[PDB]
Structure formats: C-alpha cells, structure tokens
Design an enzyme around this catalytic site. Structure first.
Site, mmCIF file in Angstrom:
data_model
loop_
_atom_site.group_PDB
_atom_site.id
_atom_site.type_symbol
_atom_site.label_atom_id
_atom_site.label_comp_id
_atom_site.label_asym_id
_atom_site.label_seq_id
_atom_site.Cartn_x
_atom_site.Cartn_y
_atom_site.Cartn_z
ATOM 1 N N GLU A 1 -63.921 -28.279 -77.758
ATOM 2 C CA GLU A 1 -62.956 -29.125 -78.072
ATOM 3 C C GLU A 1 -62.490 -29.827 -78.935
ATOM 4 O OE1 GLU A 1 -60.388 -26.912 -74.575
ATOM 5 O OE2 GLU A 1 -59.587 -28.621 -75.124
ATOM 6 N N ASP B 1 -36.924 -40.406 -92.174
ATOM 7 C CA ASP B 1 -35.189 -40.895 -92.261
ATOM 8 C C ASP B 1 -34.842 -42.236 -92.592
ATOM 9 O OD1 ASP B 1 -34.073 -38.193 -92.826
ATOM 10 O OD2 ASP B 1 -35.437 -37.708 -90.397
#
Lengths: 253, 254
Positions: free
Chosen positions: B55, B66
C-alpha cells in the site's frame, strides 16, 4: 437559459455608474459562531454593499492518525507531488503489486482519468480511496474499466451484513475490513469471520495489527492483515522491522 | 465476465490457496531520507521480505492559499463548531435582499455532496458560488447541477497567465468575473484588467488586496469593482473601525 439574478443585480449597479463593492466574511468567525452570521450580514446590508462573499472554513479529511499524518508532512517537505509520484512509479520495476491509497482531492486535482491512464504500464494494481462514498463510485469506476487496477472497497465490520454485501458486490483485488463509543461491545472476530465467508475475494483486516499476537488472531478469521503505522514509524525511526515482517509473511494455514 | 480479471485478485487468491497469510505493509510515498527518490529502495526492501502487496500512500496537501488573516479566521470558525451542514441550515434562516456568494474549496463541497448542496440552497439568498481549486477541465462536477438554478458559478481569472488562454473560462462566466493576480512598472496588471474588462460580457471585479481607499479607486478605474477580504475580516475580529471605509467605498463615483 434563465438569466441569473446575481448577474442582473451587479449589471444594474454598473449601469447606474456605481462601483461594485463585495465584502468577504468567514462564516462562523463571530463571538456567537454561526449564530452571529445573520447579524454580520445585516450589518453589511445596512451599509449598501453589492453582494457578500461568505467563506466556508476548510477542514481536511485526513483521519490516519499522528504517525501517518507526520509522515505526510515529511513527504510534502521533501517536495513530493502527485505528478512526481506518478512519474517515479513508472520508473519502478517490481513483481509486487502496488496499491495506491489516496484521498479523493489529490486524485481529483490530478484528473482521475489521467491518473489511471498514466499508471497503465506500472506496478500499480489497486486503488483505495477512503473518503469516496460507495454512492459516488462512478467518479472512478468507469476509468478503471479496461485497466489492471482494482478499486478496493472499505467495508465497516459493524454495519449490517446486507449492507456489507452491497459494498462488496463486484469487488476486485481484495476487501479492506475496517473497524472504527456505545454500550454494545461488538465481537470483531465474529464479524470478520462472517465477512470472510460471504466474500468471493480475499478479505484483509486493516485495523489494529501491531504484534504477532494480533497477526495470528486476525489470520484465523480472515485472509491476512494490513499494517500501517507500525511500519511507517519503524522506517522513519530506523527501528528494525524485518523480523516482524518475515514472521508475518511466514504465517501458515 | 467478458473483461479480463484483475491481476491483484489472482495474486492474493494464489497466496490464500497456498495456505499462507496475506501481508500488506503501508508506506507513505516520499517519507524517506531521499524523498520520492527513496521509494524504489523501500519497495525493493519489502519485496525482498516477500510481502503480498504494498500500500503506497499519497500525502494530502492543503489547498488553502487565503493568507494569515483569513487562515486564522477559519481556525476560529472551526473552533466555534462551524460545519458546512450547520452553515447551510443557518442560511435557510436568513432573509436578505443582498445576494450571497459562497466561497469554498472543493473538498468540503465534495464531502457534502455537490448536488445536495445546490438543492439545499435552492430557496435561499445564495446566488453565487466560487471554488478556487476547481480546475476548469473538471467543471462537469459542478456545472450540471447549477443548470436550472439561480446560482452562478464565478470563475477566477488570472491576470498574469494571459486572457486569451482563459477564453473558455471568461466566455462561460456567470455572475461576475473574479480577477486575481504609475508605480513598480508592473502596469501589465492595469493593461490586462482593461483587456479583460472589454472582452467580458459580465462585471469584472478586482480581488487583489484592497486595504485603502487609494487601492479601491485605482482598481475601479480599470474594472467594475472590488472584493475586500482580509481587511474586513481582520477589522471585524479586532474591533477596528470599518463602517466609514465601507460607506465611502459603496458610495464611490468614478
């Protein structure tokens, strides 16, 4: 089609020779949280603003726990990008099948179709997307149609058996069993074994394996185990993990 | 069926059929002394130990761009228990003649369900939607659901990257166009703003930092108006005076 009212309202202000003015506020940034939002909006309305931009705060979907969360930050600090990972994977030759685990956003940003096509010639044989709901499998499944990449479903052990059958219908690769309060203590071994019997492909236990005892227990009721934090932490901290893995791989019957 | 069965199923079935336990380690791609250049080494290390499969995790990167004032405001909002679901419910409560524009990153929208989000706002004051990290190529995830609605999908248009390149974004714009980017000789912004202004069929608003009346007037010379973010958020939070600034700004005549 029908013209949108926001376009009309702004055009009208412009047509009147007035400047458009749009303040931005963060929803919930108030002494009263969301209960302060009306007050803020009306305050700005009273001043005759053109429109109001209302921000939604961003929460990440990462739920992997501290060890893996830290590993992600280290990876990003090394300049890891999805694009560079894909390119690196094309380089790697191995007989071991690789299963990509990612949340949906990175996939979405890269382009799902692009991602799948770009991995066509690689050792990648599986894909796990923890925050992709079953009802939205169509976002990925079509693009996997002609490929050698299995979409692995995550199945909760504590849900009802009819629901588990639904999740695993047409499943490929393997089934990733997960187990997440309550006065009811669930017998995980029983549920794992039930899922094991019902499934037509291998069922792996994907939670709570940190010791040889854990490993033997779950192998009795499933086809195998997935081990995350222990390996990530060991590799990072330089602890030897070879013995654990050797012993785990050598599990018989 | 008619398709070729997947190799991963076969390989794991073979291990099971041999009476051996399947063992799958997880590793985070890039978590190595050499970063991504260490990935092969890690995989081969695990291959040598005879693991069933590996995995390979992809790190999740935060999309928030922002700036500090708004980043902090988001954290305050989350600490007050703000959720997308609770915001939607609160918005159904609110009556106003002012059109509201939701600004969100894609992930919260995705988690909520795009279609659900749009339908749940059907009878509300929300008339616009801005999704800064929605790539134009993948607009099909949102645009279809806005088809019969009164919610305009507002595009962000970069002034630096050249207007003709973003022709598709601009031509397929609703609500307004959010433009993002005498002194410094980067008067390329003024030129680009003006070019975008001529080409656009709807209003073009400036989303650069407006922190003063001078900022406001400069941009209004080459566009239809401004969006003011940090200044207002900071002032509201810190109790700095903001009414005069807004009054003056709203009243400005070219």
């Amino acid at each position: 089609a029908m013209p949108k009212t926001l376009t009309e309202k702004l055009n009208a202000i412009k047509a009147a020779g007035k400047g458009i003015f749009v303040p931005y506020i963060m929803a919930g940034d108030h002494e009263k949280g969301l209960d302060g939002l009306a007050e803020t909006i009306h305050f700005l309305e009273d001043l005759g603003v053109s429109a109001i931009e209302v921000g939604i705060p961003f929460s990440d979907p990462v739920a992997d726990g501290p060890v893996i969360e830290e590993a992600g930050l280290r990876s990003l600090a090394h300049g890891t990008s999805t694009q560079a990972l894909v390119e690196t994977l094309k380089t790697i030759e191995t007989e071991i099948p690789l299963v990509i685990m990612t949340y949906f956003n990175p996939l979405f940003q890269y382009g799902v179709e692009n991602f799948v096509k770009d991995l066509a010639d690689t050792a990648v044989k599986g894909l796990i997307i923890p925050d992709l709901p079953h009802e939205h499998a169509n976002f990925v499944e079509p693009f996997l149609a002609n490929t050698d990449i299995a979409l692995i479903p995550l199945v909760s052990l504590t849900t009802g058996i009819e629901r588990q059958k639904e999740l695993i219908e047409g499943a490929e690769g393997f089934i990733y069993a997960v187990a997440i309060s309550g006065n009811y203590r669930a017998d995980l071994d029983k549920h794992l074994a039930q899922l094991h019997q019902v499934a037509d492909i291998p069922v792996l236990t994907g939670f709570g394996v940190s010791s040889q005892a854990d490993l033997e227990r779950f192998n009795a009721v499933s086809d195998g185990v997935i081990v995350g934090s222990k390996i990530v932490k060991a590799l990072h901290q330089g602890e030897p993990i070879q013995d654990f893995i050797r012993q785990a791989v050598a599990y018989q019957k």
